[PDB]
Design a protein around this ligand. Structure first.
Ligand SMILES: *[C@@H]1O[C@H](CO)[C@@H](O[C@@H]2O[C@H](CO)[C@@H](O)[C@H](O)[C@H]2NC(C)=O)[C@H](O)[C@H]1NC(C)=O
Lengths: 48, 48
């Protein structure tokens, strides 16, 4: 039986915008997604 | 932007932080040489 998958983690703002301040500025309009998106992974991460 | 303990508060959006660990900040590493460069010559053109 498996036990745990690799504890992947990504930071949207990097993944979405590889250090392009213009990019992040537009994203911030989208609000709490790429907080919660980050959160669930950590929830995945810890739960591992 | 004060210091890491503060930047943590910038994430949870709480003035009080429970004991633990918190993925806080968008760390980055930097280049230090803005190198402009090229290769290794041999056969010149004889305008002689
Ligand atoms: C590339 O340019 C260099 C000159 O900067 C050529 O001169 C040297 O050739 C000798 C013998 O091959 C090497 O031991 C040297 O290392 C080369 N340059 C230096 C100072 O290290 C070189 O021949 C050219 N390309 C080749 C084929 O090596």
């Amino acid at each position: 039986l498996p036990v745990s998958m690799t504890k992947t983690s990504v930071d949207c703002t990097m993944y979405i915008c590889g250090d392009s301040t213009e990019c992040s500025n537009l994203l911030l309009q989208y609000g709490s997604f790429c907080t919660q998106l980050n959160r669930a992974l950590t929830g995945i991460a810890v739960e591992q | 932007a004060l210091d890491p303990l503060s930047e943590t508060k910038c994430t949870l959006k709480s003035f009080t932080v429970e004991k633990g660990i918190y993925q806080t900040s968008n760390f980055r590493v930097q280049p230090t040489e803005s190198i402009v460069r090229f290769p290794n010559i041999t056969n010149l053109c004889p305008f002689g």
